[PDB]
Design a protein around this nucleic acid. Structure first.
Ligand SMILES: [Zn+2]
Ligand SMILES: [Zn+2]
Ligand SMILES: [Zn+2]
Lengths: 199, 553, 198, 100, 305, 155
RNA sequence: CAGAACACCUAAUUUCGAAUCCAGCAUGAGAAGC
RNA sequence: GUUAAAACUCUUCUCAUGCUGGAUUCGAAAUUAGGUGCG
């Protein structure tokens, strides 16, 4: 269309944050120092996957509401192409309107990422059975992303904001059960013209 | 490739940003006080931008005053200095923040900021080359204060020597000749310029004083001057932070002059600890010499004794330091007994800077005069020009020096295995001042610490590891202090082995067994001598020794 | 589909010590205190909560005679069939009860002090060893919002039983010396998981 | 339009990566797959040669490059992949430069 | 830079191709004494000085070619960065010393080895560096040093690799990594009995195979890529198809999943397992037939193969 | 021309007996493998610097690896890491297996994965020593058989 | 050429930093001008 | 000196879409703020 929706998303981290490293060379280079590296850029920043978290949040809440929304989290499941999340994030037939970025941090790894030590306390004897060192992202670290909706509808900002409140409720990535990833979001959207750069 | 961020008078912010493409290396990020400007300082740190490393020369506020402020806007990744500079910066930042809260000026940074500066604060001593973002960084002593260094950064586009502040001949606790790079220096960033009398007026006041000193360098040199000349009357240190700095230079005596690396101040220096002893020594009418650091009589402890000393017609006031504008010390020195000593000067004169440039291996391409007063910088720049060296003053302010790498071997006999043009070669990476690879035909054209054998070191460390005196934590900490350098590890091992006279405890881990004291002390001396003999070895050899007992580091 | 929110509020009654885990904050703080306390970068106090809850329920349900796995043993694989694996997690399935860190309501300078502890010879009665550690004062308030995704009827009762066991034993470290004796206040509510949809 | 040739080879800038599909309930990794991807900070070079150049061709090509900056280049564009930044050095050229 | 003299920035020649030659004593244009001494010319400000010297002030660097020196010479009073001096001894010294703003690096040229070495040692003792002359950029990816005979030395034997833009220097870790990668690529090229003699199978009729394959083609279990890889593994023999269908039908003991695509429908777990073993038995009965019969079976569902 | 490699593990692609083979054509015209190269390389790496195992049957090894894979002592992660350490040489794999098997005198733990199944402690120590001896015998074989053993367990 | 504020004595040391699963699918293979 | 010679299988069309490195593990286990001194 002639308009596009830009949602600038700013994350402030409230709890410790972990998202594990996925590059095999970087992870294997970090296993000689930490047992759980943070997913990190080659420009020494931190990136978090964001499209899957928003899609999982919206699918859980819209399945709870009773809408006809598919579950693309099941093993090799195919999206049907008629859901609202299928229109937003994508389907096998057509791509999604929302173009979610990675959550690149505003700070370099030496300023927000710290190396911590977790243990396994035995139930009797209260001793350290196992001990592992993992990397984490500190509290107060700021991340930025831009969600880009190509064909905006009236319910695109509301569902993205509801999914962001669900991500604030449950956590963004990594060890969500132990208390990691509890964050907060600021949203500054703007409907920009598609022919803006031409001039 | 170097920007002088406020490098004219060092007030309201000063910095040397050597951007080398892959690294925004920063030198001398400090503040000078004159005594509303804080917003212009804030704009200048936001004008600095992201700096990959905040190299620090010395522990004065001129070079080290804005480091937690760069941490505050989160512009610095790593902060490196010497360990003496690191702990003196701890004392400086704590006292400066307490002064910001006491004077009710809006605090520049915070106490938590000071701590988070010490989160990322790495440290190395002199002659320890580190390979950071294809820049080789080395520290050399420049004799200013304890832990003060000149920085030697070899980038691919040239060698830069940030001299910092240079010491004089009158500095007693350090070596006089400032250490220099043994290689080529392309650009030299030099900071321009700005004893018996004390003893004999101490006679004409005592047998018939008050000394305002500076807590870093100046008070300890007055104390050491009184330590060499044992007269008759006593000396008192009525200064808290001066006493802590005195104790740290006693701890960091391995970073000092070689003669003073063997106590140091040979006792007889009664230091006042609390303010009640200060009020007692202020009200004490006995003839005694009171050395203490407030600076320029403006705030500190000195002011407990000032009134008592001022009205006394027998006492005297010995200015061994410069008095800056609009201070009480300047107001008592000008006249609005009074003696001023000019020999106690940490900063070098102009002729020592000419000596500093002349004993470089090569004449530098361009001498960048940066700080100091204007007219002294002008006359110094004229005397550099008389020595035929280029000067760039920061008011007035270009070849390209590429360190190329040449193969110098045959490349015709090359093959393919994995879509790579690889060829095996055995040669020699000769390193001129143009890294050169050269074949073996070229080589044929060319061709304090005790001492123990390697097997004795192996067996002694294995024995003391089984006896639990040496530990994985001990080996890890010793390896960290040894990767810092040899002298830091010497200090660490001496600090562990030293027996506390009040308690009789050494910091070594106690042995496990049925050993009687004498055997325990002989095992402790064995650990001391073994790890000093390990200190004498090479770094890779120390790593291969210590990786057997502690598998990690 | 519903979800369960368990807002717990800790009041500290005996001084609390949870050690700092971050290696940088440790080596920055091991020149002033020998035992740093666990602290955020925003200068709040952090306590792990999932492991203590799981340990309390595992000890108690093992004592009751239930078929629960012991995940405290070294490299122990959780069974995936017991109550504790349903609540806190197993190797195949994640746990329903997402348990947050205990964020203190106050800053370090308001609840955290620096104590000095001793070690005294039994014959000499003299202070042989001395050390300093950070501890959390009494009356400090911590909070957590335990979130259960697929709730059953007994999960809130198990969480309250585990909280009573933490009040019995203690949270954090140095529990045998008397540290970490705390009290909990619980506010429970069932919330629709579609409630942020507008 | 030329292909975007990288300056570095595959061992420098191409890393294989682990990507997941997680069940919405039970929060467990359901599917796993490995995919190669190009690292951040890697540089690529292209040469666009415009014959019979009109006045607006530089403006339209630069606007298209700003659109590729905002949207992305390559695949997995909805997941955050391929967000890049372009720098343009234009040069007016006579075709007879090789005829020396 | 200067190549041994061609000094690009142009390619001006001082005493080859595309040059502005400036002859000395003692192309597109020849510049000599027309312009006399004390007068400047442009091309890079060029000024000639009498010898008894070409001075190019460029954007980066002010170059001085001296020529042969015999008598007091004539030197510029500005700023010199490079000083190209002939050597074939004290006359060159003061010619250097009496010049203001002593140059960054001097260059010795046109002489033997011994005289150039003696003058070079005399100039290092004056604290001015020398260069003694007698392309893809080269990158050391190495990491210990030595000090034998006053050279900083490293014993290293390694590999040189040549790409289109750079030449890198690598150690044995890179060669081990690429050797392991190529060994993994070489061993993943063969299976032991591909394209070999035809090799314990269930048997089923052709019409039942048609019915089962059509039913597992309607729902998405047997798909076009599945039939494609099944035909490709059938082309390399019978045991290869056996190994492929055993790999596809293999239920992992840790996760309880197989490599079949899940059916599109509302089937429960037991029926999905029945469809999976139906696909396994149907394709196992399909490996029994001849190649043309299986091609006629599978062309009706995957027209490519 | 003389091949210096034994022609084992020799696959059967039609009437073309086959082996994927990586190596060096030395024109001394000998064809040696990487091992000769390392013994060459360290040769210069001590020369230029100067100028300035138990036995187990192949049936017993695959039976023991199958048994330890069933009780998850020898996991896929473990077989993979042993393969990368064995590709770096015999000494690196020896050091890695010695590191994994090493009983720490403080904790009393080994780096092996614990067995799955009801076992007594003595039998657990026997299984750990069985894994140690089996992989220690796997270092002794050449690379092409040690992959053909380990391909069945970690593809 | 810069910060400066009733008494002690001590504020050290050690151990763990590992293990495991997964790495699969599916769809498109054609048109048109010269 | 070849039924020679002369003429470019050229133009148009992004390997794209669908999938969150997730799950399992409490920095806790050792050690009295002790001694010193007259309400
Ligand atoms: Zn759908
Ligand atoms: Zn200074
Ligand atoms: Zn269980």
């Amino acid at each position: 269309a002639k308009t596009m929706k830009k949602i600038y998303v700013t994350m402030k981290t409230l709890s410790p944050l972990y998202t594990g490293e996925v590059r095999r060379e970087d992870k294997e280079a970090a296993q000689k120092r930490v047992n759980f590296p943070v997913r990190k850029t080659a420009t020494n920043k931190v990136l978090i996957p964001f499209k899957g978290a928003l899609r999982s949040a919206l699918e859980i809440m819209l399945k709870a509401k009773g809408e006809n929304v598919c579950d693309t989290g099941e093993s090799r499941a195919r999206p049907c192409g008629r859901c609202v999340t299928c229109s937003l994030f994508g389907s096998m037939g057509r791509a999604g309107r929302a173009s979610v970025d990675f959550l690149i941090s505003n700070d370099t790894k030496e300023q927000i990422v710290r190396e911590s030590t977790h243990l396994r306390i035995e139930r009797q004897t209260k001793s350290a059975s196992d001990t592992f060192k993992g990397e984490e992202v500190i509290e107060g670290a700021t991340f930025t992303a831009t969600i880009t909706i190509s064909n905006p509808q009236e319910k695109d900002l509301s569902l993205i904001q509801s999914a962001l409140k669900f991500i604030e409720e449950n956590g963004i990535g990594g060890w969500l059960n132990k208390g990691y990833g509890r964050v907060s979001f600021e949203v500054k959207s703007e409907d920009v013209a598609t022919d803006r750069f031409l001039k | 490739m170097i920007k002088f961020i406020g490098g004219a008078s060092k007030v309201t912010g000063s910095a040397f940003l050597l951007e080398t493409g892959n690294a925004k290396i920063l030198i001398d990020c400090g503040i000078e006080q004159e005594k509303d400007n804080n917003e212009i300082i804030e704009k200048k740190i936001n004008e600095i931008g992201k700096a990959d490393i905040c190299i620090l020369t010395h522990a004065h506020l001129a070079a080290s005053g804005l480091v937690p402020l760069l941490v505050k806007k989160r512009k610095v990744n790593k902060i490196i200095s010497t360990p003496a500079t690191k702990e003196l910066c701890r004392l400086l930042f704590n006292d400066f923040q307490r002064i910001q809260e006491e004077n009710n000026d809006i605090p520049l940074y915070s106490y938590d900021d000071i701590e988070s500066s010490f989160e990322i604060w790495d440290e190395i001593d002199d002659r320890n080359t580190i390979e950071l973002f294809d820049t080789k960084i080395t520290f050399y002593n420049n004799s200013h204060i304890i832990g003060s260094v000149s920085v030697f950064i070899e980038t691919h586009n040239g060698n830069y020597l940030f001299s910092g502040d240079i010491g004089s001949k009158l500095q007693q606790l350090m070596d006089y000749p400032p250490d220099m790079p043994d290689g080529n220096v392309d650009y030299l960033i030099l900071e321009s310029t700005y004893r018996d009398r004390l003893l004999e007026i101490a006679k004409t006041t005592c047998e018939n004083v008050l000394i305002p000193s500076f807590a870093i360098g100046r008070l300890q040199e007055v104390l050491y001057t009184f330590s060499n000349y044992n007269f008759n009357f006593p000396v008192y240190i009525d200064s808290p932070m001066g006493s802590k700095v005195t104790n740290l230079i006693k701890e960091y005596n391995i970073y000092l002059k070689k003669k003073l690396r063997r106590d140091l101040f040979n006792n007889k220096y009664i230091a006042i600890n609390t303010s009640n002893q200060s009020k007692e020594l202020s009200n004490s009418k006995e003839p005694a010499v009171i050395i203490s650091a407030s600076g320029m009589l403006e705030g500190g402890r000195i002011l407990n004794h000032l009134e008592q000393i001022k009205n006394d017609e027998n006492s005297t006031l010995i200015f061994v330091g410069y008095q800056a504008q609009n201070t009480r010390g300047r107001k008592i020195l000008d006249g609005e007994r009074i003696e001023k000593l000019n020999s106690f000067s940490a900063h070098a004169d102009q002729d020592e800077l000419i000596d500093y440039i002349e004993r470089l291996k090569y004449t530098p391409y361009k001498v960048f005069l940066v700080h100091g007063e204007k007219e002294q910088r002008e006359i110094l720049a004229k005397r550099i020009i008389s020595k035929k060296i280029r000067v760039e003053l920061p008011e007035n302010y270009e070849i390209l020096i590429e360190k190329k790498v040449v193969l110098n071997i045959n490349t015709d006999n090359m093959c393919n295995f994995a879509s790579y043009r690889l060829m095996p070669f055995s040669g020699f990476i000769v390193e001129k001042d143009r890294i050169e690879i050269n074949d073996k035909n070229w080589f044929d054209m060319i061709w304090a610490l005790p001492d123990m054998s390697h097997d004795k070191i192996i067996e002694n460390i294995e024995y003391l590891f089984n006896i639990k005196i040496l530990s994985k934590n001990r080996i890890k900490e010793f390896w960290e202090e040894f990767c810092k350098g040899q002298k830091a590890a010497i200090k660490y091992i001496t600090q562990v082995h030293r027996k506390n006279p009040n308690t009789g405890r050494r910091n070594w881990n106690p042995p496990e067994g049925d050993f009687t004291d004498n055997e325990i002390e002989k095992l402790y001396e064995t650990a001391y001598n073994t790890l000093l003999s390990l200190i004498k070895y090479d770094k890779n050899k120390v790593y291969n020794i210590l990786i057997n007992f502690n598998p990690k580091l």
